[PDB]
Amino acid sequence: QDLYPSRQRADAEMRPRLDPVVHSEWTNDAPISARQAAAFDRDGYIVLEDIFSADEVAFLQKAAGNLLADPAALDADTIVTEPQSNEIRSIFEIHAQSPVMARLAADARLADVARFLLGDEVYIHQSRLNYKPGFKGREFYWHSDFETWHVEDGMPRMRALSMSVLLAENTPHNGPLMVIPGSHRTYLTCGVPDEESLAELAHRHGIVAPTGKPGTVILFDCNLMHGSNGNITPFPRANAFLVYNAVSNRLEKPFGVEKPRPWFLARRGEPAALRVERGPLV
Amino acid sequence: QDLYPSRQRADAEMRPRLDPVVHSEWTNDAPISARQAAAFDRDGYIVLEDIFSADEVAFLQKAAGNLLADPAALDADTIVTEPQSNEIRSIFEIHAQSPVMARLAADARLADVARFLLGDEVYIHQSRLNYKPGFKGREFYWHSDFETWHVEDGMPRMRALSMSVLLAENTPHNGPLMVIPGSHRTYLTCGVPDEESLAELAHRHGIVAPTGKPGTVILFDCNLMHGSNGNITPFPRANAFLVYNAVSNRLEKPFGVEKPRPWFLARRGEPAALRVERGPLV
Ligand SMILES: CC1=N[C@H](C(=O)O)[C@@H](O)CN1
Ligand SMILES: CC1=N[C@H](C(=O)O)[C@@H](O)CN1
Ligand SMILES: O=C(O)CCC(=O)C(=O)O
Ligand SMILES: O=C(O)CCC(=O)C(=O)O
Ligand SMILES: [Fe+3]
Ligand SMILES: [Fe+3]
């Protein structure tokens, strides 16, 4: 029942992936092009530009701006500072609190791609606004999102993806998301990946740090190795994260101990199919 | 006496540069092109690529890893290590402690450009060899070299430049040095520059981060605002740092209190000129 055991041996292994990456047959009636599906297959991520209008983008940026400026109105449980601070690092369940964000996640232009790639109905496993403050923004060391979702939340299979919607401009200077392309086809066991292994992957695959204007979307497979550096620039980097999970891939018990995990980190346990909203955002 | 007062008020000022940036008239005798010289004037830095042969590059790389591997053989005060291990991170006065580095700093391809740009005979105010490992590389916040060299060392005029000779590859990803071009014409008073000022400079000049294969040289005016982000990548940062000061501009007493500063951070007091060296490094 555990296809992806981790944190059990005193060594790390590079286990082979035992799941599809794209879980659908591609055809003309798909939300992305055949080349785009093959890219995701091969690289474990793709980038979508100009899929929202500037009115849509502008509306979005204020939704995030407003949530991040009145943090006494939202669940105190769902706020992450840089602990020794009170500058915000993330805000969880933003699909659950902000209506604007809820409407975003349910939009066809995101969810249909999510359903095509996962070949199933989808639901939000998790959401976050990773506001990366200028001057004092701290990094996110390398990790496979799936390796925590699996051991800690009990996500059984590789059938999920993240969508990062950029709300500030991501230049190469304010700590954008870096990925190791192709790393999604290796399951690297551990709770933090080991330097020697990481070194092997990045050598084998190099590193990409996709940039883009606000409204650009980065979609990466749940098992892609990724991270980011800190941000000392005056430019904040606020990026909404949406984790789509296939409903077939509902959470069983955590394939580890410390079971279970806080409610906003991971949605348990019986999901309803997302209702896909076709339209703009006003 | 003091043209550049700093650390003497609770309010920082942005004061104007009262020195030239390029101290010489350009002709066809200059070791750089007229557009390069104009670019240094305007931007505060330029980048020389391919001035060293690959053999010469491999030679410097071999000598620097040698020096970094052998702390026994070097002055103990001029060493910096990691507060958890005995890994070297810096060696000061390498222009002194290493004959190779002493020959790099006297090479015409480097010293003649300083002599032109500074319009005087030069000498090493400070040299360094830096190894910044991957994975755990630390940030290094914004600051003008000249501000500390003025207040703490007694450098009286803006008549110095820094040369960073890349010994490992700097991609956009491994925390490469960042500069705010044009900020060398503004003297930001204070010993850390404040955020609002830094934001102002970055908003009006933007941020650039010169990358390059090893052997690439980055030259920058002493008062150019710079800094770097952290480095989680598996790719180390390594460089030879060389500060050329014009002999005309030798250190007086500090324009602050805490007089003075350790020998290996700033060469007092009546230095001789450097002797340029033409020819290969092997
Ligand atoms: C809940 C969550 N866990 C992973 C982690 O803890 O690194 C991350 O990849 C993202 N979100
Ligand atoms: C000793 C030295 N100090 C500056 C600094 O640490 O802020 C750097 O800009 C250059 N060299
Ligand atoms: O935005 C970041 O740099 C963190 C990305 C990440 O690993 C996540 O929380 O999904
Ligand atoms: O100190 C650092 O590492 C930032 C780069 C720099 O200013 C230097 O070391 O010369
Ligand atoms: Fe993540
Ligand atoms: Fe510096």
Curated annotation (Swiss-Prot), chains A, B:
Keyword Protein biosynthesis attached: no
pH dependence: Optimum pH is 8.
Thermal properties: Optimum temperature is 40 degrees Celsius. Active from 5 to 50 degrees Celsius.
Residues where Fe cation binds: 143, 145, 226
Protein residues bound to L-ectoine: 126
Cofactor or coenzyme needed: Fe(2+)
Enzyme class: oxidoreductase
The record's free-text note on cofactor binding: Binds 1 Fe(2+) ion.
E.C. no: 1.14.11.55
A molecular function (GO) term: iron ion binding
Protein role: Involved in the biosynthesis of 5-hydroxyectoine, called compatible solute, which helps organisms to survive extreme osmotic stress by acting as a highly soluble organic osmolyte. Catalyzes the 2-oxoglutarate-dependent selective hydroxylation of L-ectoine to yield (4S,5S)-5-hydroxyectoine.
Subunit structure: Homodimer.
Protein name: Ectoine dioxygenase
Taxonomic source organism: Sphingopyxis alaskensis (strain DSM 13593 / LMG 18877 / RB2256)
Lineage of source species: Bacteria, Pseudomonadati, Pseudomonadota, Alphaproteobacteria, Sphingomonadales
Gene (name only): ectD
